[PDB]
Design a protein around this ligand. Structure first.
Ligand SMILES: C[As](C)(=O)[O-]
Ligand code: NA
Length: 9
């Protein structure tokens, strides 16, 4: 299973 959560703020 693959999860990549990115946040740029
Ligand atoms: C190798 As996969 C994208 O089925 O977790
Ligand atoms: Na997988």
């Amino acid at each position: 299973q693959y999860n990549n959560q990115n946040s740029f703020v």
